[PDB]
Amino acid sequence: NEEPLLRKVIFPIQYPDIWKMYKQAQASFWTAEEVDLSKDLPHWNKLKADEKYFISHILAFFAASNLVERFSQEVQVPEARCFYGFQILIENVHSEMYSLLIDTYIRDPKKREFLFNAIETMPYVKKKADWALRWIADRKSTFGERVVAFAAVEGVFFSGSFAAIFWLKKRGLMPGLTFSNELISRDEGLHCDFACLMFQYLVNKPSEERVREIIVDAVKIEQEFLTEALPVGLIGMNCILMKQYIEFVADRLLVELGFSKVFQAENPFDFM
Amino acid sequence: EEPLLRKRFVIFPIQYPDIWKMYKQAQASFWTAEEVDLSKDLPHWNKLKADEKYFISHILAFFANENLVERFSQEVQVPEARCFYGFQILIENVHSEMYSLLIDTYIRDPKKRPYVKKKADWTFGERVVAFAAVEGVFFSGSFAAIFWLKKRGLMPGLTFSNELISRDEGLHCDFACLMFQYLVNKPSEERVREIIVDAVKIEQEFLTEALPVGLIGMNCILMKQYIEFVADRLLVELGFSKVFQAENPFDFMEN
Ligand SMILES: [Fe+3]
Numbered sequence: 063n064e065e066p067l068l069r070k071v072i073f074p075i076q077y078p079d080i081w082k083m084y085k086q087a088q089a090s091f092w093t094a095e096e097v098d099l100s101k102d103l104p105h106w107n108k109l110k111a112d113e114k115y116f117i118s119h120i121l122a123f124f125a126a127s128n129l130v131e132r133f134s135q136e137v138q139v140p141e142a143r144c145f146y147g148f149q150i151l152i153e154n155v156h157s158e159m160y161s162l163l164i165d166t167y168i169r170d171p172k173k174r175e176f177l178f179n180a181i182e183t184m185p186y187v188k189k190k191a192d193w194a195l196r197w198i199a200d201r202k203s204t205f206g207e208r209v210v211a212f213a214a215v216e217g218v219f220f221s222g223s224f225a226a227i228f229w230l231k232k233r234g235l236m237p238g239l240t241f242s243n244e245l246i247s248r249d250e251g252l253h254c255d256f257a258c259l260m261f262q263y264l265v266n267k268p269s270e271e272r273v274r275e276i277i278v279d280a281v282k283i284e285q286e287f288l289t290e291a292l293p294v295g296l297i298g299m300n301c302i303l304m305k306q307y308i309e310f311v312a313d314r315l316l317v318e319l320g321f322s323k324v325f326q327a328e329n330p331f332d333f334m
Numbered sequence: 335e336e337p338l339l340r341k342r343f344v345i346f347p348i349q350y351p352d353i354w355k356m357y358k359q360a361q362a363s364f365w366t367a368e369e370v371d372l373s374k375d376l377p378h379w380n381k382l383k384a385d386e387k388y389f390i391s392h393i394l395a396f397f398a399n400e401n402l403v404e405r406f407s408q409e410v411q412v413p414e415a416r417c418f419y420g421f422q423i424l425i426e427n428v429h430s431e432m433y434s435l436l437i438d439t440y441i442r443d444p445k446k447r448p449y450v451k452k453k454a455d456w457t458f459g460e461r462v463v464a465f466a467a468v469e470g471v472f473f474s475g476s477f478a479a480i481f482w483l484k485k486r487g488l489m490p491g492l493t494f495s496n497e498l499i500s501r502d503e504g505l506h507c508d509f510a511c512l513m514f515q516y517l518v519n520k521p522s523e524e525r526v527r528e529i530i531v532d533a534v535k536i537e538q539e540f541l542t543e544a545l546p547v548g549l550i551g552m553n554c555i556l557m558k559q560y561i562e563f564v565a566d567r568l569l570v571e572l573g574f575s576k577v578f579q580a581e582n583p584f585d586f587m588e589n
């Protein structure tokens with residue numbers, strides 16, 4: 063309780079800018095039903111064996127993916143709690159959408175079964191697990207550290223896959239997948255932005271050194287996935303350029319938290 | 335332990351269609367505070383008596399917890415249930431914003447801007463019922479009081495917000511009953527009564543001793559009856575029998 067966010071009639075609003083972001087969340091409310099998948103199987107069938115493997119897998123990883131309930135309890139400002147309550151909900155809309163997309167492109171139930179049991183095995187899930195239990199759950203962890211981890215989960219992890227799905231939009235393919243990709247990644251941006259806003263109200267925040275360790279570690283994990291394990295070559299993208307994008311994204315985040323760049327990586331993707 | 339408390343990778347194909355249908359119903363009743371127009375209430379408020387202002391402000395003060403759903407939501411494993419609870423969390427935030435706006439609209443003077451204690455102190459199944467009780471028994475008499483204001487044609491912002499909020503609590507309370515059905519081990523009829531009947535006592539004391547509905551022209555004996563009626567309706571919903579046998583006295587609460 064040295065911290066304004068942490069210390070124990072919502073109106074009038076004390077924090078207009080926390081509140082403005084809640085209001086932006088509400089403004090952009092949607093449901094998985096809103097998204098039209100009727101024109102997708104034709105485009106899907108035009109994809110090649112390697113591109114279907116890739117798309118079906120990154121979807122499964124999106125689906126495989128509860129720290130927000132913890133922040134909502136911990137943070138004591140009503141304005142913030144409203145934003146986290148909306149975040150809980152919209153995340154559940156994300157899951158529905160991924161389930162819908164899979165069910166639309168993987169029609170046979172046993173194929174879905176093979177697919178998911180594979181994905182539980184894989185490194186990307188274990189590595190992201192180990193990272194969160196290292197930087198969130200450790201309980202030598204601090205609140206400032208968790209805020210930075212929180213921001214990374216939203217803005218570094220899956221950043222490369224949103225980009226991959228945007229690359230397909232460039233080629234006029236799969237309008238339901240790409241349209242839902244836009245809504246979801248927009249939602250993540252806002253969530254990443256909110257975490258960066260909270261970080262600005264901290265009395266005790268972590269060393270630039272420490273902020274780099276959390277962030278650059280996620281970059282390690284995300285780059286490995288999309289270049290080593292499930293390479294973007296599978297859908298005609300360049301690996302080197304993707305590693306660079308992940309770093310541009312991570313540099314942007316460091317600067318949002320008020321620190322200097324580490325990688326100096328420019329954005330390689332016009333379409334982004 | 336229990337199906338609702340035990341362990342999914344992908345929502346579809348839906349497993350508990352009845353719980354899912356409730357989530358979809360919640361989604362279909364989405365609203366925000368700004369959709370309720372409070373710009374004709376102050377003139378009405380200024381025409382009220384001293385005792386009507388007293389009553390309305392005080393119930394609005396007690397209207398102004400979903401810590402508990404941030405616990406149910408974490409404990410329940412069935413994805414369809416977790417979806418409903420997510421949406422419930424959102425809607426109670428809409429409710430609080432609504433009640434803050436109302437207070438702010440009528441009690442413009444900052445300086446001006448009990449029952450509380452009895453609620454505070456007051457197995458998964460027990461918590462479900464106590465949870466159902468909060469939605470259903472607590473504040474049911476306050477909902478009826480504002481439906482009385484509507485019958486006299488007063489305070490249209492308050493009364494409309496009340497219709498919306500009442501409807502949500504109905505759904506939220508119904509949902510706690512659907513959860514209760516799915517329990518394999520549930521407390522006996524004896525425990526439910528204790529929880530529901532303690533609830534009724536607290537609510538009855540509140541709207542007839544501390545802050546009598548007589549202040550807005552209502553009959554207390556009848557308000558006591560209606561609270562008992564709501565409690566009865568809950569007991570039967572949870573799969574038990576009535577304890578009070580109370581008829582709903584209010585013709586205006588019949589739609
Ligand atoms: Fe998110």
Ligand SMILES: [Fe+3]
Pocket residue numbers: 426469502503506
């Ligand atoms: Fe409720």
